Amino acid sequence: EQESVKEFLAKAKEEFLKKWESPSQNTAQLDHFDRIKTLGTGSFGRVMLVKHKETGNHYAMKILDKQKVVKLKQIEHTLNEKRILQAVNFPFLVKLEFSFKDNSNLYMVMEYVPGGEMFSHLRRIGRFSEPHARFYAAQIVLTFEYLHSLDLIYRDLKPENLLIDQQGYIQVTDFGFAKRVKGRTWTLCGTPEYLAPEIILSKGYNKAVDWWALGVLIYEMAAGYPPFFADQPIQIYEKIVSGKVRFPSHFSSDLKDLLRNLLQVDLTKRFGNLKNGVNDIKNHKWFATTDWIAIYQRKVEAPFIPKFKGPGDTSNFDDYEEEEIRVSINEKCGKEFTEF
Numbered sequence: 001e002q003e004s005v006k007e008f009l010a011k012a013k014e015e016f017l018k019k020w021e022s023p024s025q026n027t028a029q030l031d032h033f034d035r036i037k038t039l040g041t042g043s044f045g046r047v048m049l050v051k052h053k054e055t056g057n058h059y060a061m062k063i064l065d066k067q068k069v070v071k072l073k074q075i076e077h078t079l080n081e082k083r084i085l086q087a088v089n090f091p092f093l094v095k096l097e098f099s100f101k102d103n104s105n106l107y108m109v110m111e112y113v114p115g116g117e118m119f120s121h122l123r124r125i126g127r128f129s130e131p132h133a134r135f136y137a138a139q140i141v142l143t144f145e146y147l148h149s150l151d152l153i154y155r156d157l158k159p160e161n162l163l164i165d166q167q168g169y170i171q172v173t174d175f176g177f178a179k180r181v182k183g184r185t186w187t188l189c190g191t192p193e194y195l196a197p198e199i200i201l202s203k204g205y206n207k208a209v210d211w212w213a214l215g216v217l218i219y220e221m222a223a224g225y226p227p228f229f230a231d232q233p234i235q236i237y238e239k240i241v242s243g244k245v246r247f248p249s250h251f252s253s254d255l256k257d258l259l260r261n262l263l264q265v266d267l268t269k270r271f272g273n274l275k276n277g278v279n280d281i282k283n284h285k286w287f288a289t290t291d292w293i294a295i296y297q298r299k300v301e302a303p304f305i306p307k308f309k310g311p312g313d314t315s316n317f318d319d320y321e322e323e324e325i326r327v328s329i330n331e332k333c334g335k336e337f338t339e340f
């Protein structure tokens with residue numbers, strides 16, 4: 001690789017390690033914000049649109065219930081999420097602006113991206129043309145190049161976690177399964193449709209699982225549906241381990257060739273995990289029209305710009321029951337969350 005790429009990644013790792021070793025803590029509190037709307041929910045928390053009362057700036061506030069985190073065995077994963085987010089910096093990652101806790105909850109306050117999830121736009125239009133899919137895929141290739149050089153694995157790539165911003169570019173959100181890993185790791189986690197074979201077979205696995213998930217994402221963007229699906233997870237898993245995939249006839253020959261090498265069931269033969277690493281992907285014929293520097297600099301005109309009226313518009317997100325943010329008069333689970 002060119003020395004300019006090597007020096008860029010060496011500086012990125014230096015800046016990450018300084019924040020990783022000395023994390024920020026307790027940088028706002030709940031009554032500094034007004035609550036506006038619930039943007040989405042989940043197994044042990046939700047994300048709310050909020051407005052800061054002194055500056056007027058909008059944020060996306062992720063709220064996790066401490067007792068429920070403990071019951072669903074997610075303590076280590078929650079601590080991973082906040083420690084990684086306060087230490088990274090890259091054009092296509094959401095920015096964490098504040099974090100804090102109280103007697104009942106943990107809070108992560110991020111810059112708000114009003115354009116909505118990629119999932120909504122893909123399901124609305126049906127599928128993306130190959131140039132449109134390729135513009136998004138290039139941003140994910142550069143983001144994984146960055147995260148993997150910091151010894152991080154992301155482990156939750158899927159369309160609902162890719163937000164579309166005011167310039168039509170991607171910002172990746174939700175680091176709940178991200179982890180710093182020197183060699184191998186073992187936890188069963190992810191969404192069934194995106195899991196690599198070595199996770200399903202309970203092996204020790206590495207960053208090659210993120211390149212498998214990139215193959216599932218590019219197939220889904222260009223076809224409109226993922227390659228492996230069924231009503232029961234055990235049926236999805238049998239299809240993933242089989243080593244067979246079927247492609248629509250409208251796919252280009254170059255796209256089919258790239259996807260056979262990302263959706264390779266033998267992890268020692270998979271693109272992204274060979275001696276040349278990410279450069280086997282960047283140099284593939286499907287990416288021949290891509291200007292990697294121009295994408296990083298945000299100089300390429302996007303395929304589309306989401307429709308929205310202002311920085312507080314919620315029209316690209318959907319409607320959920322509005323529930324209280326209740327804070328107990330007694331402290332819960334203080335010991336488990338000391339480092340947060």
Ligand SMILES: COc1ccc(-c2nnc([C@H]3CCNC3)o2)cc1
Nearest residue numbers: 039040041047060110111112113173
């Ligand atoms: C950075 O600005 C945002 C905006 C919205 C969300 C968000 N909205 N919903 C979710 C989860 C629940 C349903 N899917 C994922 O995250 C995150 C950050």
Ligand SMILES: COc1ccc(-c2nnc([C@H]3CCNC3)o2)cc1
Nearest residue numbers: 073074075076077185186187188189
């Ligand atoms: C009863 O058999 C098991 C199997 C797996 C696990 C397990 N899977 N993940 C974890 C956490 C420790 C490693 N980081 C997350 O424990 C625990 C008990």
